[PDB]
Amino acid sequence: QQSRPASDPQVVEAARKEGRLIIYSSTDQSSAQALLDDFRKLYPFIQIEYNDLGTQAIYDRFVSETAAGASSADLLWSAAMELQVKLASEGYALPYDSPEAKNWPANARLGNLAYSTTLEPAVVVYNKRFLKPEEVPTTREGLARLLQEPRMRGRVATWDPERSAVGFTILKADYDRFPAFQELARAFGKAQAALYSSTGAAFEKVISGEHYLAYGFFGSYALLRQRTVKDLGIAYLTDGTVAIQRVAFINKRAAHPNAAKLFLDYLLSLRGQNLMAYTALIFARRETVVGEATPQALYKAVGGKDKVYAIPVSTEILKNLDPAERMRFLTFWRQAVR
Ligand SMILES: [Cl-]
Ligand SMILES: [Cl-]
Ligand SMILES: [Cl-]
Ligand SMILES: [Cl-]
């Protein structure tokens, strides 16, 4: 007793003829594997080429291949929201109204061009051998107070927003939405915060104890690592949570557009959103999913849906690519943290 995605039978038959699907994705293949296996159970006639790539790498390969008239991906799935919206904003995406997106929220799609697949909170993580939960504040002001402690000097990690597309988006959204972020950033400076472009490199120092606490990394990644890392703790912010959305679109110039429609539909479905939340611990976008990596669990943890600010799948976020907008944030950031 399972659902299938509500893909049009004619799209299924055109996909059967294509026989192939090429994905460029920022989602770790180990994370996506159960999704890929389940999709191939539904559609065994589709061979998948899954290209696990960094966000900038995805954008550069896609626009370079397109520019040269080389064949490129059928489907782009990336946590770099502004780069994905920029490509859809510029006519790279195939217009497609997914039958699985009828109730997709407004801040979760750019018309019939690009869709959110996830709703992923920026959280606090910590090493349980060095900080007890009672020592870990759940507000920006609390964290700024913790980072005044001499013993927290050198013991904090966060993003380097100058070397991560995704770290920029999260910390810029924080800076734009929460006044208390400015007091927290100065505290990063006091505490000699180390800045990472890799969530993995940041978590390695937290796990080893070189840092005790990390700010601004994805709840999805933290829950996944908890499956095997028993010392990693998660604290959800109760004064306001920024959430990012992994955006998918179909290449207008896809060789296999109908296979890509099936895969998009699959990702937005009840079936695909549940499997993603259950297997990958990637926080779902779909509001009805049940489990820890879901909007309902997240709203409960932060004290309500009104405490979550979803970065929207909208051309408004292209202001983050304007140097004038970047500079006000980055000037404050460089000063506060060094
Ligand atoms: Cl359509
Ligand atoms: Cl990583
Ligand atoms: Cl925990
Ligand atoms: Cl929904």
From TrEMBL:
Q: Does the keyword Membrane apply?
A: no
Q: Where does Mn(2+) bind?
A: 28
Q: Where does Mg(2+) 2 bind?
A: 28
Molecular function terms, GO-annotated: metal ion binding
Q: Which SUPFAM superfamilies match?
A: Periplasmic binding protein-like II
Which keywords label this protein? Metal-binding, Plasmid, Signal
Does the record carry Metal-binding as a key word?
Answer: yes
Fetch the InterPro entries from UniProt: SBP
Q: Where on this chain does Mg(2+) 1 bind?
A: 26, 28
- Record's Gene Ontology CC terms? outer membrane-bounded periplasmic space
Which named protein is this? Iron ABC transporter, periplasmic iron-binding protein
Native species: Thermus thermophilus (strain ATCC 27634 / DSM 579 / HB8)
